[PDB]
Amino acid sequence: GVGPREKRKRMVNTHVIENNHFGTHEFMMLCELLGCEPYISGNVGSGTVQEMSEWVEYITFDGESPMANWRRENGREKPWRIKYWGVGNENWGCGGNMRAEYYADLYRQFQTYLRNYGDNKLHKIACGAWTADYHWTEVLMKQAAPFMHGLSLHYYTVPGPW
Amino acid sequence: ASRVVVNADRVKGTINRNIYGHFSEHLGRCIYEGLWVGEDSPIPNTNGIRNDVLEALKQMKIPVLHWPGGCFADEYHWKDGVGPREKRKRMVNTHVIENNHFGTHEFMMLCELLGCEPYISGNVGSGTVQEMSEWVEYITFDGESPMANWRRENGREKPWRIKYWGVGNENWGCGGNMRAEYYADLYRQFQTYLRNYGDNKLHKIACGAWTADYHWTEVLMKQAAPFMHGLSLHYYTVPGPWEKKGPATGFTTDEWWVTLKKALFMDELVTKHSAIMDVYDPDKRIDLIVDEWGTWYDVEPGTNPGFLYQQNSIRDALVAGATLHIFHRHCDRVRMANIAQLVNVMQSVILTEGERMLLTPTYHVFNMFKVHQDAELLDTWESVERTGPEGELPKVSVSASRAADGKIHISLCNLDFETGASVDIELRGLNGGVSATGTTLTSGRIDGHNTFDEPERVKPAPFRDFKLEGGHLNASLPPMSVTVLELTAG
Amino acid sequence: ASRVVVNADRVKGTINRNIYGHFSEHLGRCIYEGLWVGEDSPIPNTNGIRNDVLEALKQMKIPVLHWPGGCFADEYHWKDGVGPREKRKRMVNTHVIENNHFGTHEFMMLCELLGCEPYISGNVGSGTVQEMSEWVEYITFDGESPMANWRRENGREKPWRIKYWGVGNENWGCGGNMRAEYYADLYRQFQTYLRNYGDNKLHKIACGAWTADYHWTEVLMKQAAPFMHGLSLHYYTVPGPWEKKGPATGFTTDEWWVTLKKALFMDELVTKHSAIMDVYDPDKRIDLIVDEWGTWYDVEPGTNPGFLYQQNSIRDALVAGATLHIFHRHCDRVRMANIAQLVNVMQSVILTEGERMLLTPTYHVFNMFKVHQDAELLDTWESVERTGPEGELPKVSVSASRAADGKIHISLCNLDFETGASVDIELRGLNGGVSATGTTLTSGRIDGHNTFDEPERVKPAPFRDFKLEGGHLNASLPPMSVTVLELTAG
Numbered sequence A: 001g002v003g004p005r006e007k008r009k010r011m012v013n014t015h016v017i018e019n020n021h022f023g024t025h026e027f028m029m030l031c032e033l034l035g036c037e038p039y040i041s042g043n044v045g046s047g048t049v050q051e052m053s054e055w056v057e058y059i060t061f062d063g064e065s066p067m068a069n070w071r072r073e074n075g076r077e078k079p080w081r082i083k084y085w086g087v088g089n090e091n092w093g094c095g096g097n098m099r100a101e102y103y104a105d106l107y108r109q110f111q112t113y114l115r116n117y118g119d120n121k122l123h124k125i126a127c128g129a130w131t132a133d134y135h136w137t138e139v140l141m142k143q144a145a146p147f148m149h150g151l152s153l154h155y156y157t158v159p160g161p162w
Numbered sequence B, C: 001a002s003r004v005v006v007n008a009d010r011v012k013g014t015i016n017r018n019i020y021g022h023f024s025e026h027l028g029r030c031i032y033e034g035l036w037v038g039e040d041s042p043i044p045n046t047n048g049i050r051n052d053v054l055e056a057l058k059q060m061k062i063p064v065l066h067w068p069g070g071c072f073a074d075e076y077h078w079k080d081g082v083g084p085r086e087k088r089k090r091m092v093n094t095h096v097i098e099n100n101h102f103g104t105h106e107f108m109m110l111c112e113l114l115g116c117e118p119y120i121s122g123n124v125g126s127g128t129v130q131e132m133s134e135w136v137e138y139i140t141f142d143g144e145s146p147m148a149n150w151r152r153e154n155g156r157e158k159p160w161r162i163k164y165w166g167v168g169n170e171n172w173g174c175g176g177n178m179r180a181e182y183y184a185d186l187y188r189q190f191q192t193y194l195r196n197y198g199d200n201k202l203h204k205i206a207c208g209a210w211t212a213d214y215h216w217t218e219v220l221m222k223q224a225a226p227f228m229h230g231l232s233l234h235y236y237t238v239p240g241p242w243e244k245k246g247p248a249t250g251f252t253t254d255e256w257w258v259t260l261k262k263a264l265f266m267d268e269l270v271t272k273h274s275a276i277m278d279v280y281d282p283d284k285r286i287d288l289i290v291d292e293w294g295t296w297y298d299v300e301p302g303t304n305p306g307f308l309y310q311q312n313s314i315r316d317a318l319v320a321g322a323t324l325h326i327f328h329r330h331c332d333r334v335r336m337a338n339i340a341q342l343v344n345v346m347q348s349v350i351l352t353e354g355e356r357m358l359l360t361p362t363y364h365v366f367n368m369f370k371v372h373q374d375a376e377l378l379d380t381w382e383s384v385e386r387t388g389p390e391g392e393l394p395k396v397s398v399s400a401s402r403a404a405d406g407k408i409h410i411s412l413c414n415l416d417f418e419t420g421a422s423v424d425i426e427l428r429g430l431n432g433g434v435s436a437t438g439t440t441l442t443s444g445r446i447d448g449h450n451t452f453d454e455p456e457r458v459k460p461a462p463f464r465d466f467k468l469e470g471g472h473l474n475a476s477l478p479p480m481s482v483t484v485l486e487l488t489a490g
């Protein structure tokens, strides 16, 4: 979702009709125009540690590096600031069908490599429970509390059966 | 006096020379003005490596060098440090100038120049399994493959040999903040794909405990012992709280005693960790490898705290002396150790500033003690005077080796800065009578250090302050001394 | 030849005399013809205990006796064995006769007559907490209470003293088939209510592992180490399958080698169990107590298999000799051991048949070696000839103590039945020169045994087959020997 908009990746099928015209630059810009805080969730389920690490570099790094230089080629000179960074979402489900014990180990690992560049200071957020999985909350706090600034929770209001 | 017997005919094992090992990183000017200066530097160099340092390290007989090690291991992507030096990746913070001019080829070359063993740590924290696998292929594979062919493009035709391969470092901390249970699962997975190509034979090393995390050791041995050739251990000597460690020079007498007391804790750690290894590995197949040790102070005032620059007193020499003795005492299990670090960083053997370099007291110990490298430990039994303000510490630390050429070396540390130390030494199991030369390393001040202006304040001198009554050897050790005696039979 | 050095000035520790301990059960004629005969028996006795055996055990300097021990401990209800002997409980299987004539008073008295320590195992398996608690009250309480007053009615005014109290035995087996996790919880509970009355001080002992259940040891130390003074261990030497163990005499040369190989396995067990205890108890506060060991054969043909009556060859003496040596080598942790059993049962020191008794080869070793009881172990370094059909075993086992009176004792076992054994012994650390007496115990046949008809076939003789060149001591050991040398300084 970065680089010349015209030559970004494209999934399309109506047997995902996604052109990636809206990516990181577009989003950060949006938050600037609205005057709201950006909150990004990185990819744990199908992503790698270097991938997520580099995303933060790309966005927040004021110095000279492949990622930062690439940000500038792509048209943003100064870094952006971001507080809220989610280290995966929905990891009990469509984000890897993980046990809490397991997501917690990945959370700890991934968050390790999300660095504070310039005077950016990250608020790291771990994926919390779905509805009433109090077990999930118990495990994440027991195993990862020291390594997180926040913990998420998901509850939709659904009148009927799924 | 302090009584010591040396059953000179009772070998107790081999002191693996790799105990006298070192370690360097890319956090600071360890690998950036200290060693690597560049092919086009005004400082006299051999293929980019300054010769003053080479000369000194060759003389010290460095046995093994560990790179990347520490935190850097689990940040590094090795492919960033190969290919045309001109076109390698470049990370630079203007507040860090990492240009990756020093990479795999440069390191292997360095180890060849020094005649030391290479010890590399792959990236578990932020790396992948294929990444690490490919690194070993790249280095060791004699056949035809993308990685091997790439090694040759990059200018090395035949494979290299490498024994010591670390599968992550510091994984409980800056290498992923992993639980032991978890690192162990990754270790098993990663190590699976590190193959022995050609006639290279890997010594696979799992990341072991920080300080007194006996739990970590227990779990790694319980879960992974069959899949490892060695297990690491990390313990720095820190005088104060982590938030205010204390200085390298101009420190109190309290800071002296506390520094040594902290250093000697190494014996407890090694004992207790070995104890656990014994349970899961009774025949001691698996090496214990203390790949991080040495003093850690606050940086010299008016230097960047992140650069870790610290001075090196006679204090630092005592720590080095006593700790090496402790490894000697544990050479049944301990088979490698790596002091932190090599140049300009923490407890370095060498400091540099432009084209000037000096040898630290710490250098002098490693140089003096090299007589113990691959030597044979001798049964020594001892009763030593206490010292220090509560009678805490031993006044004296002593060790005896038998070199290959038959000669006998006895190293002695006097930990009291305040007064010298008397040592009667009975030698049993002898052949003829014996004659004895001697070197000593001491200082006038408690923080005796070498500077670029006066780089020879603290250096080894001849030692003659002892009588040798063919059998007994009574000896008179200077305050804050490190001393080696060399005995020849007949 | 076999080389041995004895650093005669280097004490390695104390050999707790309780290593030379024994153990008896209500099993056959151990407590019932072997020891207890009764006040008005025709066998000459002291308050019901036959004097021929007392005399012999007093001679041997028995240090400690364990009763009930084995399975019986966790079946016994101690109140069944106090009160008027006339009106005590009576269990009889007519297919084995328990009249409870030998109970608490009788046992305590026995230990007083022998001058040995009592070691009692309370009943966890089938007993209650108050039951065990009250037993200790009954024995040790100087004041006024139902239990103490009952002791006095039953004829003992002052309390007794007792150190060694076992909180169950064999709890993994015939004492409840308990998991370790579970026994540990009961151990903690029971031991809570065993109080120190008067100035009696209890040494509480938890039931340890059977053979190589290292798991049991791990769990007991992990869960209960703080609540115990000692931990037990059980290992019998069994030549064959459990269903067909092999005989005490008329056995093959293969059965000799196998028997000794099994016996020597004790070193591995003690090492590996100690290793684990070291992890949870680095300072070795807790005693390791091997309260069941010895050979276990098929019963003499045409005797009741359930009575466990077996003979005692020179083979049995070798096992006893070598095993005691192994305990010596481990006296840093091992502080008590109890051979099974005392009389007429398994590897007994004494056999009886009516008023006739004999001393077994095993007796002769315990008697010969008593010079080691509460002695000081000396640094010995050795290189020994191999023996046995695969070069399996050491030809020689040797150990050195320094008695209180300054004298030095060196015990030696030659495990080859086929030929004698040469042993050069260098003695360092001495003052004066030394003179040397010597005893040896050997045999014409590999199954050399004592019978009631010829009870002196195998007994200690003087040993003079050695030259002492005032420093070296070359010695010429008989086949299947056990040998003690006594050196006096000057």
Ligand SMILES: [Cl-]
Residues within 6 Å of the ligand: B016, B017, B374
């Ligand atoms: Cl080597």
Ligand SMILES: [Cl-]
Residues within 6 Å of the ligand: C016, C017, C018, C374
């Ligand atoms: Cl005692």
